[PDB]
Amino acid sequence: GSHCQKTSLRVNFEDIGWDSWIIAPKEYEAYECKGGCFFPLADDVTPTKHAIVQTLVHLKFPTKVGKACCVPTKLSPISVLYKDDMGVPTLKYHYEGMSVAECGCR
Template sequence: EFAVEPELVLLDMQSVPAGQEGWLAFDVTSASNHWLVHPRSNLGIRLYVETEEGGAWIGLVGRRGPRSKQPFMVTFFRENQIPCRPPRAAKPHPRKRKPKYDLPVPNFKGYSENRGQPCKKHELYVSFSDLGWKDWVLAPTGYSAYYCDGECFYPLGACMNATNHALIQQVVHILKPDEVPKACCAPTKLSPISVLFYDDNNNVILKKHRNMVVKTCGCL
């Protein structure tokens, strides 16, 4: 019996001058996406280096090399957004779920307002190239930052993730619309991302930057 070597798929390729120093970033998104769906297909990544004449002559750092020069993978995942619907009148139910706030909600009979889209998270992809940062940011080339937008309706439903302060402000706004604004749609939870970049001394740095990605939105 003969062992059949798995078919190799070209993921990325770069031409590098002989005197270049620093890290090289390769896009292996297609392979990682395939591995998530078919884990058994993950047979690793092969790196092949050759000169213009076709001969391999460069040395590579192995697992026993210094940790500062070990290769690594940076991955980003896109979060699914659960749509948030505006609150609507419902019949009283003995097991009705209690809102996160335990303050009494005034009943403003006859009160109405122009309703648009409710406060929720929206797509926003930030390209570091568009920001003029491509010369010092190595990876990623961009990321999904998201943003919050929409109206905070009265009464503030559970899907609007409102604070007690927002509830009080919304009530006061109804009583004094010219003095107090409505509650604002803003991020209530954010997460970091890791960025590989050059510092002022041209050293390659991997740093986790806080509060870069909107996870949830709410009325504040």
């Protein structure tokens, strides 16, 4: 079974062009949600009714409707050292929505 779950994704800020304002860290663990949303479903996939219905419609009309998507359903913050307006290193202690805490089918 190849289902919806959290897997590693280490993100280098230089690589996405955010080194222009993030001094540190260089890299972080963002994680990614990977996996299929198909029947039979897993139990920590926490599907909405809509995701279930859509997956079923896709099974019957695959060319016309896509299947539900394995996505983050909860995110966590990281700390970033960034450059203030004046250019001063300023800590953002809780920089929200940066790392995957949980995945599910939506």
